[PDB]
Amino acid sequence: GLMQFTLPVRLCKEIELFHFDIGPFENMWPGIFVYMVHRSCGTSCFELEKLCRFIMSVKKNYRRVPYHNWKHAVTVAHCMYAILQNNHTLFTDLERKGLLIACLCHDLDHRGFSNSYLQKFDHPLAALYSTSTMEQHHFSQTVSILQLEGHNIFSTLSSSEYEQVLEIIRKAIIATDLALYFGNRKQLEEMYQTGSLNLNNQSHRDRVIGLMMTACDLCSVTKLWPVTKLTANDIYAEFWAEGDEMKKLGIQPIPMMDRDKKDEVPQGQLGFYNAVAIPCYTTLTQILPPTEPLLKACRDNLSQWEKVIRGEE
Numbered sequence: 403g404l405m406q407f408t409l410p411v412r413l414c415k416e417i418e419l420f421h422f423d424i425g426p427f428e429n430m431w432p433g434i435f436v437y438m439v440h441r442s443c444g445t446s447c448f449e450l451e452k453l454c455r456f457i458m459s460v461k462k463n464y465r466r467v468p469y470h471n472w473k474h475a476v477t478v479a480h481c482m483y484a485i486l487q488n489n490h491t492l493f494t495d496l497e498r499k500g501l502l503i504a505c506l507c508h509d510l511d512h513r514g515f516s517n518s519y520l521q522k523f524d525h526p527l528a529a530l531y532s533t534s535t536m537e538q539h540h541f542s543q544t545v546s547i548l549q550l551e552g553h554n555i556f557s558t559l560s561s562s563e564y565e566q567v568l569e570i571i572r573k574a575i576i577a578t579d580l581a582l583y584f585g586n587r588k589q590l591e592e593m594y595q596t597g598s599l600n601l602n603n604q605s606h607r608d609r610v611i612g613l614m615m616t617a618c619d620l621c622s623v624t625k626l627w628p629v630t631k632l633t634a635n636d637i638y639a640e641f642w643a644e645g646d647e648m649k650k651l652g653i654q655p656i657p658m659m660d661r662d663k664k665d666e667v668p669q670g671q672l673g674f675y676n677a678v679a680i681p682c683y684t685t686l687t688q689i690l691p692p693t694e695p696l697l698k699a700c701r702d703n704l705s706q707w708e709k710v711i712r713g714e715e
């Protein structure tokens with residue numbers, strides 16, 4: 403009850419910044435997550451014993467894949483923490499509760515393959531979930547873990563607050579399907595420019611939380627350049643393995659997943675920053691001005707990829 407998680411001084415200060423890297427010590431990640439729940443939500447939000455059991459079962463249900471792993475989950479939850487702490491008064495107690503959980507859970511049981519590869523392989527998940535295949539799976543794994551004995555961190559909520567939090571988590575997880583982001587961001591851009599954007603409209607908040615989810619999920623592009631560049635290596639290690647698997651099915655992968663296009667990576671990152679990342683953090687900064695450091699760090703990393711192309715790095 404009188405028990406506070408604390409961090410060494412460098413971590414206690416840097417965890418508050420958007421560009422924080424959670425580090426290579428796996429055994430500190432649970433503590434880092436509880437620290438963030440306690441400060442964004444309160445020591446009162448969850449029973450510590452239930453929360454600890456939930457976190458450890460979530461970790462066990464992430465796989466040892468190069469990118470979509472337990473480190474990615476905690477990284478995406480820290481970006482959410484930074485958004486919530488810089489926009490204190492914009493969010494309900496249930497949103498604060500749900501969104502860090504949604505972030506920790508958003509890629510549960512990922513196998514390192516895209517929705518498109520499950521559909522071409524004809525994986526059973528592709529017949530159970532026709533669109534947002536993995537993202538419906540991640541939400542289904544989150545519910546499974548919440549129903550294990552001693553793992554219901556939400557047991558203090560009413561039937562209706564419980565139904566609301568699971569609905570916030572479901573939408574937040576579904577929104578991490580990047581196929582859905584493009585249309586979400588265009589609707590948000592238009593609503594903001596014509597001044598129709600209204601945070602009392604539930605379906606507007608839903609879209610804003612959707613964009614916050616894309617922003618957290620993409621947050622590797624908002625780190626210090628060596629973090630950005632080394633994470634890119636993990637991202638391609640997956641994509642290229644998927645490319646190999648496409649060739650095994652007799653299918654030319656897209657360029658992004660073809661390891662023979664290794665040399666064009668600097669240019670693929672440019673398209674990605676211009677087509678996806680920069681527009682994501684721009685719209686986010688218009689709607690939530692204190693998230694600007696994410697846009698500023700993304701722009702810095704774009705000009706680092708530009709330098710790689712010019713042969714200056």
Ligand SMILES: Cc1ncc(C)n2nc(CCc3nc(N4CC[C@@H](F)C4)nn3C)nc12
Nearest residue numbers: 620637657658663666667669670671673674
């Ligand atoms: C940093 C980051 N965070 C999240 C995600 C989902 N992604 N996806 C990419 C891939 C970006 C990309 N690379 C390529 N190619 C073309 C052939 C070669 F040049 C590589 N095309 N594209 C679009 N990087 C990220």
Ligand SMILES: [Mg+2]
Nearest residue numbers: 508509578579
């Ligand atoms: Mg995902």
Ligand SMILES: [Zn+2]
Nearest residue numbers: 508509578619
């Ligand atoms: Zn993710």
